[PDB]
Write a protein that binds this ligand. Sequence first.
Ligand SMILES: [Br-]
Lengths: 193, 11
Amino acid sequence: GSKKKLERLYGRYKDPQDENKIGVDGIQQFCDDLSLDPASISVLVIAWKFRAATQCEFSRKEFLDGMTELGCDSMEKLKALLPRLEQELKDTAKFKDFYQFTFTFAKNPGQKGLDLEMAVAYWKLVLSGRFKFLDLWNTFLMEHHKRSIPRDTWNLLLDFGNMIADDMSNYDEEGAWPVLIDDFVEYARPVVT
Amino acid sequence: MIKLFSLKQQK
Ligand SMILES: [Br-]
């Protein structure tokens, strides 16, 4: 009898043209109800707790299972959890999952890579103040017109950010680093010396 | 939901 308030609350957001998903306007309302910027990290966290497949929509099962898992039948209970969830992102292993989730969440379904502009936007979001070289990294990619970002390069950039020194000296010129990261270093090394 | 603005202006 707990699903009662939850089913009703789902009906608030469901796409009129598809009962099995929360659509564009529904996502806009859901965010509006939470008093959050749709594009905020806080919304991203919620989707990550929902285990959402693709940005800008939730399946009827993504919403119900997710809210159920957090034990929330309202939008205030959800809000009350935000910080406890946002803090949840201190754990290194928990943040990695979130970070890697961001890739598959952000990209188009059925395509292997992530478009550059979306990747930058999502990097700014998740990796802001985690990465000393973010600004230079995005610029690097924009200037050379790499149109797409592979999963391998996305996932490993995290590890790169964790271990790279202010002067990049500890970076081994051999490495097991994906080409794109290595190119960045060979570009970025002069700019810091 | 970065793409939500573009997807609203497109629908
Ligand atoms: Br589903």
